[PDB]
Nucleic acid binder design. Structure first.
Ligand SMILES: [Mg+2]
Ligand SMILES: [Mg+2]
Ligand SMILES: [Mg+2]
Ligand SMILES: [Mg+2]
Ligand SMILES: [Mg+2]
Ligand SMILES: [Mg+2]
Ligand SMILES: [Mg+2]
Ligand SMILES: [Mg+2]
Ligand SMILES: [Mg+2]
Ligand SMILES: [Mg+2]
Ligand SMILES: [Mg+2]
Ligand SMILES: [Mg+2]
Ligand SMILES: [Mg+2]
Ligand SMILES: [Mg+2]
Ligand SMILES: [Mg+2]
Ligand SMILES: [Mg+2]
Ligand SMILES: [Mg+2]
Ligand SMILES: [Mg+2]
Ligand SMILES: [Mg+2]
Ligand SMILES: [Mg+2]
Ligand SMILES: [Mg+2]
Ligand SMILES: [Mg+2]
Ligand SMILES: [Mg+2]
Ligand SMILES: [Mg+2]
Ligand SMILES: [Mg+2]
Ligand SMILES: [Mg+2]
Ligand SMILES: [Mg+2]
Ligand SMILES: [Mg+2]
Ligand SMILES: [Mg+2]
Ligand SMILES: [Mg+2]
Ligand SMILES: [Mg+2]
Ligand SMILES: [Mg+2]
Ligand SMILES: [Mg+2]
Ligand SMILES: [Mg+2]
Ligand SMILES: [Mg+2]
Ligand SMILES: [Mg+2]
Ligand SMILES: [Mg+2]
Ligand SMILES: [Mg+2]
Ligand SMILES: [Mg+2]
Ligand SMILES: [Mg+2]
Ligand SMILES: [Mg+2]
Ligand SMILES: [Mg+2]
Ligand SMILES: [Mg+2]
Ligand SMILES: [Mg+2]
Ligand SMILES: [Mg+2]
Ligand SMILES: [Mg+2]
Ligand SMILES: [Mg+2]
Ligand SMILES: [Mg+2]
Ligand SMILES: [Mg+2]
Ligand SMILES: [Mg+2]
Ligand SMILES: [Mg+2]
Ligand SMILES: [Mg+2]
Ligand SMILES: [Mg+2]
Ligand SMILES: [Mg+2]
Ligand SMILES: [Mg+2]
Ligand SMILES: [Mg+2]
Ligand SMILES: [Mg+2]
Ligand SMILES: [Mg+2]
Ligand SMILES: [Mg+2]
Ligand SMILES: [Mg+2]
Ligand SMILES: [Mg+2]
Ligand SMILES: [Mg+2]
Ligand SMILES: [Mg+2]
Ligand SMILES: [Mg+2]
Ligand SMILES: [Mg+2]
Ligand SMILES: [Mg+2]
Ligand SMILES: [Mg+2]
Ligand SMILES: [Mg+2]
Ligand SMILES: [Mg+2]
Ligand SMILES: [Mg+2]
Ligand SMILES: [Mg+2]
Ligand SMILES: [Mg+2]
Ligand SMILES: [Mg+2]
Ligand SMILES: [Mg+2]
Ligand SMILES: [Mg+2]
Ligand SMILES: [Mg+2]
Ligand SMILES: [Mg+2]
Ligand SMILES: [Mg+2]
Ligand SMILES: [Mg+2]
Ligand SMILES: [Mg+2]
Ligand SMILES: [Mg+2]
Ligand SMILES: [Mg+2]
Ligand SMILES: [Mg+2]
Ligand SMILES: [Mg+2]
Ligand SMILES: [Mg+2]
Ligand SMILES: [Mg+2]
Ligand SMILES: [Mg+2]
Ligand SMILES: [Mg+2]
Ligand SMILES: [Mg+2]
Ligand SMILES: [Mg+2]
Ligand SMILES: [Mg+2]
Ligand SMILES: [Mg+2]
Ligand SMILES: [Mg+2]
Ligand SMILES: [Mg+2]
Ligand SMILES: [Mg+2]
Ligand SMILES: [Mg+2]
Ligand SMILES: [Mg+2]
Ligand SMILES: [Mg+2]
Ligand SMILES: [Mg+2]
Ligand SMILES: [Mg+2]
Ligand SMILES: [Mg+2]
Ligand SMILES: [Mg+2]
Ligand SMILES: [Mg+2]
Ligand SMILES: [Mg+2]
Ligand SMILES: [Mg+2]
Ligand SMILES: [Mg+2]
Ligand SMILES: [Mg+2]
Ligand SMILES: [Mg+2]
Ligand SMILES: [Mg+2]
Ligand SMILES: [Mg+2]
Ligand SMILES: [Mg+2]
Ligand SMILES: [Mg+2]
Ligand SMILES: [Mg+2]
Ligand SMILES: [Mg+2]
Ligand SMILES: [Mg+2]
Ligand SMILES: [Mg+2]
Ligand SMILES: [Mg+2]
Ligand SMILES: [Mg+2]
Ligand SMILES: [Mg+2]
Ligand SMILES: [Mg+2]
Ligand SMILES: [Mg+2]
Ligand SMILES: [Mg+2]
Ligand SMILES: [Mg+2]
Ligand SMILES: [Mg+2]
Ligand SMILES: [Mg+2]
Ligand SMILES: [Mg+2]
Ligand SMILES: [Mg+2]
Ligand SMILES: [Mg+2]
Ligand SMILES: [Mg+2]
Ligand SMILES: [Mg+2]
Ligand SMILES: [Mg+2]
Ligand SMILES: [Mg+2]
Ligand SMILES: [Mg+2]
Ligand SMILES: [Mg+2]
Ligand SMILES: [Mg+2]
Ligand SMILES: [Mg+2]
Ligand SMILES: [Mg+2]
Ligand SMILES: [Mg+2]
Ligand SMILES: [Mg+2]
Ligand SMILES: [Mg+2]
Ligand SMILES: [Mg+2]
Ligand SMILES: [Mg+2]
Ligand SMILES: [Mg+2]
Ligand SMILES: [Mg+2]
Ligand SMILES: [Mg+2]
Ligand SMILES: [Mg+2]
Ligand SMILES: [Mg+2]
Ligand SMILES: [Mg+2]
Ligand SMILES: [Mg+2]
Ligand SMILES: [Mg+2]
Ligand SMILES: [Mg+2]
Ligand SMILES: [Mg+2]
Lengths: 148, 209
RNA sequence: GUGUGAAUACAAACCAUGAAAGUGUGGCCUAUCGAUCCUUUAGUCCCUCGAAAUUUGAGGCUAGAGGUGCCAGAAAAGUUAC
RNA sequence: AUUAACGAGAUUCCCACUGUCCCUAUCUACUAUCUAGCGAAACCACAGCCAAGGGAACGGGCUUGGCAAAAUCAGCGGGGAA
RNA sequence: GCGAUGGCCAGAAAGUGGUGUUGACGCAAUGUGAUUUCUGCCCAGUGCUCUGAAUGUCAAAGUGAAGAAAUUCAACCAAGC
RNA sequence: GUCCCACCCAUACCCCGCCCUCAGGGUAGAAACGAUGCCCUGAGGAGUAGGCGGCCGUGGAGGUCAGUGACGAAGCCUAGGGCGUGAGCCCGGGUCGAACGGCCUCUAGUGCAGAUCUUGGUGGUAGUAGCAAAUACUUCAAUGAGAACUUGAAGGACCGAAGUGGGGAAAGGUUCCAUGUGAACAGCGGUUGGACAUGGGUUAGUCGAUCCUAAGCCAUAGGGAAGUUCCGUUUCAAAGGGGC
RNA sequence: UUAACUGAACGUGGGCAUUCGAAUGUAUCGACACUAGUGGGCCAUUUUUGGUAAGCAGAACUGGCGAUGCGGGAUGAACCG
RNA sequence: AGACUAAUCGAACCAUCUAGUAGCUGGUUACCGCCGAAGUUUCCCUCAGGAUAGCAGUGUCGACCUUCAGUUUUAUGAGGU
RNA sequence: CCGGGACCGAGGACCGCGCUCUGCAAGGAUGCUGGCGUAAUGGUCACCAGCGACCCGUCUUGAAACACGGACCAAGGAGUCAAGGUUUUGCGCGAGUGUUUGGGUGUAAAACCCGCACGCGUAAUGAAAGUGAACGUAGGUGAGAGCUUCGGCGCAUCAUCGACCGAUCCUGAUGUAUUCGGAUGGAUUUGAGUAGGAGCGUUAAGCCUUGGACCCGAAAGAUGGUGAACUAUGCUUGGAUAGG
RNA sequence: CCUAGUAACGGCGAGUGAAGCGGCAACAGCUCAAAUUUGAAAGCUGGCUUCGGCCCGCGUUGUAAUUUGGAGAGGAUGCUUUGGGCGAGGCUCCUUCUGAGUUCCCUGGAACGGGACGCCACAGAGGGUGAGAGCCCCGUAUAGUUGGAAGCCAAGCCUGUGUAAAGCUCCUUCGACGAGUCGAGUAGUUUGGGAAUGCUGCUCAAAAUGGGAGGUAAAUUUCUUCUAAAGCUAAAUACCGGCCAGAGACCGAUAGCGCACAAGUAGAGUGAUCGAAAGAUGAAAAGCACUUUGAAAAGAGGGUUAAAUAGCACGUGAAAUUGUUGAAAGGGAAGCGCUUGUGACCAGACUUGCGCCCGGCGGAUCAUCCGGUGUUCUCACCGGUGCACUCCGCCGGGCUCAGGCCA
């Protein structure tokens, strides 16, 4: 919508808000990233510290599928089971049955452990598991088993 | 010419991009054309389904390894197990792929069952009405409700494994002796040292002799 | 209140000197000097070559040197009276 | 370094000759000039009398004075920083 | 400067052209500028030109040695300088 | 030079009225209110470059005024009126002839004095500069609305055979001849014209082209070039015509 | 850290307002976000450098013109109100 | 003679690439209300130009925090005109 | 304590502070009287008079300038559009969020409906192999709006001392494929991290970049074509120039 | 669509930049060289022919059948499979036909406008007709209907048959597979391709479980995956240049293409090429008969028309500039600001309103009560009852209050 913009309010005022002494010429200072090392250095060092240089070794023909392993913390583990069944376990009505969670079927490969876990035994099947996550699931009565 | 705290721009607009711009104002017009072509094709194939039968296939990468999908055609070994001639398969709606192999036995068994029940559901009209043959339908059950999609009626039943399972307590297994985390570290370092360990053992045998 | 040069006070090691308290992180104080890319040497015994091993070769990580004197650092000779 | 002949080439002097000059005067033809018919262009912020002052340090316009009477024809080259 | 298997010159190339229906009293490239009388000294510098015993410098290919190989190191070495 | 009385006037200071901006308060057992409203109190106002807010106009789109109009819509002219601080809005009179507005949202090729700006039109200068090379015209009669530059006769002059004479090549293309004619053109006039309108006119065995070759150009045999095409003219070719 | 519960920093508990310990003002408190124009300057009192001097060149504190009319200096960007 | 090559020559004319680039000249369209500048610091083949800090506007949030100040008074330090 | 003159009249039931207290000069003007009821008061336009008043736009420390553009009038005429960022405003859903590449359907380029994948977000840190976030009621101390049983509990945010994950530098337990493994405890080090999630889609404005980029403007450079009717040089074939 | 502005390239400066996997649209597969028909070149161009065939030629330096790596060949073994001809009925193209007022009155030159009364509608899209028309006319909506031509698709029937040819299950053994090519060195170009991704020139020049690829050069030892140097083939995709059609929050004669018109035309240049200006009388020409002045162009009368203030210089007809008539000013510029005066012209406002008292005229109906209905449930309307000191309208007389302008 052009009916309300600052160009309509500039009618009748010479120079259209760009100044008299500085007249808004074509391209003062250069085009694009010109002057990175010569006259735009002061801007390119106060912000963007690190534009120039080489760091690290290079990799030819990287395939990102080799590096796919999404992770999930341990405090969100109970959120995988459906709500109706979930409330039964926390309320304490089963007392004799344990759930078996399959992380791969939900799209996870590594089980990290960050929060706390209630004292109910579970079984977790993961491709990878952290050292701290294995201890917390074990002290709750459960066990974690690798599945590949 | 940067002036403030900005993100460094990279806009690939220095060629003559204006000469190659592809606007899509014919999105609804093209859709009408395809629907006219589908129903025209379905009319030509009056009692036949529009599509063709496909097998079940697993994706080839470690990511996507879990899911399954439809393939291109049945291997020559799958057709032989179900007792279907190679030449007769393409002419009754079955798709054949001659450059695929059955490395495992799970995939071979799954596809054979998926192809065997299709043969039971097939109605085969005779070439000439006045003289039927042994393999033809005997005209008594030619009148029945039929399907035409064959992609929804024969799609993948479930692509992923069930989300979870529920088992009684005292049936939970015991883990690896060392533990799950340490079982991975040991298995990783064993492959790293497979070469160093092998030559040291071998040269010892020659050193003593 | 960015960089380079130079400077002050401690901490953790190893030493010199003196009977000892102490003093010493270059010249009694104020000047005496140098980025990115590339090359080269020192260091650990370390990481990668992406189908798997073993030795050559190559690439990385940390600290110095080769230089820009127009010294916050392009590679550069004249003439026009047509 | 000299050199006969030749030159719409540069330079100095002498004889003849003359309005170049002392020093200007007169005559003829075609215009300019007046009339009938035909009939353009450059240029133009608005415009058109001066003296001093101050001012972007040389005014047609501002300040203080001089002054100042319709409408017009033929000439002229001081000014309009024409 | 040149005796034709050649000198000067044109063309992207060609079983292609110009001088040339020509052959040194000829063709081609430069400086001075009728006749008369004359035209001195300098080869250090910058060019041009001549003679290869000299080994100094020295490319690709080829030859020799080391290595499991990629590769590295040695002699030899046209013209020009 | 020094001292003392009275008086004169700035958009400054004091008091009062009105406008806008900013700040602080009051208003529901609602007899209540464009609550974005109304009522009470105090202080302030200069401004280029620049920032933000509120409003007015133009061409189109959705909704709505059960809107105006051949008993006159839009447009244009008008030292005739009313409203707003202002851009602007509204009415009266004259001319004219078929479509056009108000209000809330949507949309953009949306507002001019300048750019030696673009296209078209018109002025002052101005009835002014000027229409002056090639020696030159005059009397009577006829035609006609009208005669210096149309026609006849008679005088006076010029070009003076390297001509203002008599015929051609290049180039032009009907300008050649007859009859007739309002405007336009012939930088004055015009009955006259190389102008305008209607008709007519160019005859070859002997004059030229046609035939032959010159400098030169282009096919063929062959060789180059990715190719449009370049070289080659007797060249490393099985190349022709005469009689019965 | 000291011969040393001797010190050193940070603390629990308790005591001290009857008056929170100079004047005046508070017509303007603290923090954050995004961005415009500008980066040729010039004049005056006091201090002051080069120059014979300049309506010349170069600086320090503050006030002005630029960006600003109004009343006085007849006139006059900067002087007085 | 830098002469001539269609009024064009110290490199002809016609179309296209082409709306060739410009730190440099010129222009940039209605009204009212409120706030209101800079020619200075550091770096750049930088000095007719840019980036950086300052001066400026708008949008707000934290409290109405009793905090603050281009100022005086009292006590106590530094300086070399 | 008594005279003389000028300018002004805001507000619109009662309420208040008071006094000289059957009332009043006390929170803002009323009373009496005359002429005329139309061009009389008032308004528009033209002219004379007193005072004031240099030509606009633009660059500039300084313009009325002897600085530049402009003779006059009418119509045209200059910050736009797309992709990608960023902060702020409105709206939907919220540990999630986004239907429209595509399919179903239709009164047919509209509207309505469906889901597998995928993008951004939910976890960081190293060049890399790799590893991967709770001692405590998710901590202690000083300020904090609001609430409160009056004792206290204390959101957002600011300062300060600690704890946990990755990297870097030390220490090297039990064990053992006797060279592998890396527990535990430290360090004036380091990160765009953890410490009771805040993001995703869309709307509107300012600003930034590349694109013709607010509009008009060079002296040049390149690709492919047309000219010897002028003039320059040469070739084949013709012509012309008194008398002393 | 996503991967992805990612791995990588780059005076590592300005800048540049793919692929595998994943979801969808659309789906379809095949024949040659290398074998001896060898118990029979079984194959083909051409010419003639009565239509049955004959003749010459091509070809053994290889024409048909058989085989193409998925295999296949050669053997075993029992079952199965295969030709011709009709054909309802349905779908595309052109062509015949399709509902309802010119009813009545007013304005007007002419109703298609205003008012009254009707009708049609699976048809109220659009245009014409003397001004805005669903019913005056062409068309528009719906399935049918008249007639005709040629190809497709296909329900289901009627008939031959194993000399031949084809498919499946097993096996000791056999199992031919593309050369100046692949690969290597060197040079130039190019790419995200980095001790060299593709391409081309020159030198060298292979092999049989061989050969290529596996994104860092080299040697030794394993592993995975395909089969190069010969060939064919629909759909999903691009495009408004050619022939047609339907549309728009597009422009409205200096705009929109250079061209709404006898526009790539007139005109300019030796040539390549450059390239405009220009739409509108009225519903209908009814485009001015006749008279008179003039040499003529034309004028003055008189006519056509709703209008000639529409006369082929034609709808509306603005500004710059000009003519006539009327008003005013002027001693080397004019214009303009503040404030009076003179002359000309002009908008408002005022011209009565309310209340009380007396008299007169005219009407039905004020308080009250009963029945019915509504509603905010206690306030009203309608019907009846009143019947003159009440209520309502008008006229005449008297009085109070207020109302325009300047003082
Ligand atoms: Mg402004
Ligand atoms: Mg400007
Ligand atoms: Mg600027
Ligand atoms: Mg530099
Ligand atoms: Mg510092
Ligand atoms: Mg420093
Ligand atoms: Mg020490
Ligand atoms: Mg010393
Ligand atoms: Mg260095
Ligand atoms: Mg470098
Ligand atoms: Mg490896
Ligand atoms: Mg590899
Ligand atoms: Mg270097
Ligand atoms: Mg420097
Ligand atoms: Mg550079
Ligand atoms: Mg001499
Ligand atoms: Mg001589
Ligand atoms: Mg004269
Ligand atoms: Mg005259
Ligand atoms: Mg003067
Ligand atoms: Mg002077
Ligand atoms: Mg003067
Ligand atoms: Mg002047
Ligand atoms: Mg005067
Ligand atoms: Mg003069
Ligand atoms: Mg002038
Ligand atoms: Mg020769
Ligand atoms: Mg010489
Ligand atoms: Mg000479
Ligand atoms: Mg000579
Ligand atoms: Mg001589
Ligand atoms: Mg000599
Ligand atoms: Mg010499
Ligand atoms: Mg010599
Ligand atoms: Mg060599
Ligand atoms: Mg040599
Ligand atoms: Mg005042
Ligand atoms: Mg005031
Ligand atoms: Mg428009
Ligand atoms: Mg009208
Ligand atoms: Mg009309
Ligand atoms: Mg515009
Ligand atoms: Mg204009
Ligand atoms: Mg302007
Ligand atoms: Mg013009
Ligand atoms: Mg003119
Ligand atoms: Mg004259
Ligand atoms: Mg003449
Ligand atoms: Mg003359
Ligand atoms: Mg004359
Ligand atoms: Mg003459
Ligand atoms: Mg006549
Ligand atoms: Mg006569
Ligand atoms: Mg004459
Ligand atoms: Mg003569
Ligand atoms: Mg004569
Ligand atoms: Mg002669
Ligand atoms: Mg003649
Ligand atoms: Mg005649
Ligand atoms: Mg004439
Ligand atoms: Mg005439
Ligand atoms: Mg005539
Ligand atoms: Mg004639
Ligand atoms: Mg003619
Ligand atoms: Mg004869
Ligand atoms: Mg002849
Ligand atoms: Mg002939
Ligand atoms: Mg001949
Ligand atoms: Mg030729
Ligand atoms: Mg050839
Ligand atoms: Mg600067
Ligand atoms: Mg700046
Ligand atoms: Mg200056
Ligand atoms: Mg500047
Ligand atoms: Mg001055
Ligand atoms: Mg100075
Ligand atoms: Mg100066
Ligand atoms: Mg001032
Ligand atoms: Mg003054
Ligand atoms: Mg004075
Ligand atoms: Mg010269
Ligand atoms: Mg020419
Ligand atoms: Mg010329
Ligand atoms: Mg040239
Ligand atoms: Mg050109
Ligand atoms: Mg432009
Ligand atoms: Mg240009
Ligand atoms: Mg203001
Ligand atoms: Mg202010
Ligand atoms: Mg300038
Ligand atoms: Mg601020
Ligand atoms: Mg001193
Ligand atoms: Mg000192
Ligand atoms: Mg008041
Ligand atoms: Mg009056
Ligand atoms: Mg004056
Ligand atoms: Mg100047
Ligand atoms: Mg300025
Ligand atoms: Mg000015
Ligand atoms: Mg001047
Ligand atoms: Mg200037
Ligand atoms: Mg200038
Ligand atoms: Mg001018
Ligand atoms: Mg103008
Ligand atoms: Mg004028
Ligand atoms: Mg305009
Ligand atoms: Mg955007
Ligand atoms: Mg998601
Ligand atoms: Mg990682
Ligand atoms: Mg509190
Ligand atoms: Mg832009
Ligand atoms: Mg050019
Ligand atoms: Mg160049
Ligand atoms: Mg010629
Ligand atoms: Mg010649
Ligand atoms: Mg002679
Ligand atoms: Mg490259
Ligand atoms: Mg590229
Ligand atoms: Mg895919
Ligand atoms: Mg035949
Ligand atoms: Mg077969
Ligand atoms: Mg049929
Ligand atoms: Mg009909
Ligand atoms: Mg009538
Ligand atoms: Mg009607
Ligand atoms: Mg009509
Ligand atoms: Mg109609
Ligand atoms: Mg009708
Ligand atoms: Mg092959
Ligand atoms: Mg090759
Ligand atoms: Mg190339
Ligand atoms: Mg290459
Ligand atoms: Mg093909
Ligand atoms: Mg129009
Ligand atoms: Mg046009
Ligand atoms: Mg026109
Ligand atoms: Mg227009
Ligand atoms: Mg045009
Ligand atoms: Mg022509
Ligand atoms: Mg017209
Ligand atoms: Mg007439
Ligand atoms: Mg007559
Ligand atoms: Mg009319
Ligand atoms: Mg008439
Ligand atoms: Mg008309
Ligand atoms: Mg006219
Ligand atoms: Mg007209
Ligand atoms: Mg006029
Ligand atoms: Mg005079
Ligand atoms: Mg004046
Ligand atoms: Mg007056
Ligand atoms: Mg009643």
């Amino acid at each position: 919508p052009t009916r309300f913009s600052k160009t309509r309010k500039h009618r009748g005022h010479v120079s259209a808000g760009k100044g008299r002494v500085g007249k808004h010429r074509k391209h003062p200072g250069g085009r694009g990233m010109a002057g990175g090392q010569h006259h735009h250095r002061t801007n390119l060092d106060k912000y963007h510290p690190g534009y120039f240089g080489k760091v690290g070794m290079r990799h030819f023909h990287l395939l990102r599928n080799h590096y796919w392993r999404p992770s999930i913390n341990i405090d969100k583990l109970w959120s995988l089971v459906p709500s109706d069944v979930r409330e039964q376990y926390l309320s304490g009505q089963k007392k004799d049955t344990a759930p078996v969670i399959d992380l791969l079927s939900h799209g996870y490969a590594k089980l990290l452990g960050k929060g706390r876990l209630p004292e109910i035994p579970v079984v977790v099947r993961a491709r990878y598991v952290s050292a701290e996550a294995e201890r917390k699931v074990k002290e709750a009565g459960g066990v974690v088993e690798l599945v590949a | 010419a940067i002036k403030h705290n900005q993100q460094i721009p990279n806009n690939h607009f220095r060629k003559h991009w204006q000469r190659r711009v592809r606007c899509h104002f014919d999105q609804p017009g093209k859709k009408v054309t395809r629907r006219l072509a589908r129903r025209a094709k379905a009319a030509a194939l009056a009692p036949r389904p529009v599509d063709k039968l496909r097998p079940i296939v697993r994706c080839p990468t470690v990511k996507y390894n879990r899911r399954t999908r439809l393939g291109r055609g049945f291997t020559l070994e799958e057709l032989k197990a179900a007792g279907i001639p190679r030449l007769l398969a393409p002419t009754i709606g079955i798709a054949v792929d001659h450059r695929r192999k059955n490395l495992s036995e799970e995939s071979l068994a799954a596809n054979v069952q998926r192809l065997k029940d299709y043969k039971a559901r097939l109605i085969l009209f005779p070439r000439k009405s006045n003289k039927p043959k042994k393999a033809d339908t005997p005209k008594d059950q030619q009148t029945a409700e039929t399907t035409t999609s064959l992609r929804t009626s024969f799609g993948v039943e479930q692509p992923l494994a069930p989300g979870f399972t529920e088992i009684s307590k005292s049936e939970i297994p015991a883990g690896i002796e060392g533990g799950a985390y340490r079982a991975l570290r040991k298995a990783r370092s064993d492959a790293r040292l497979v070469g160093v360990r092998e030559k040291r053992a071998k040269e010892k045998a020659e050193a003593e002799a």
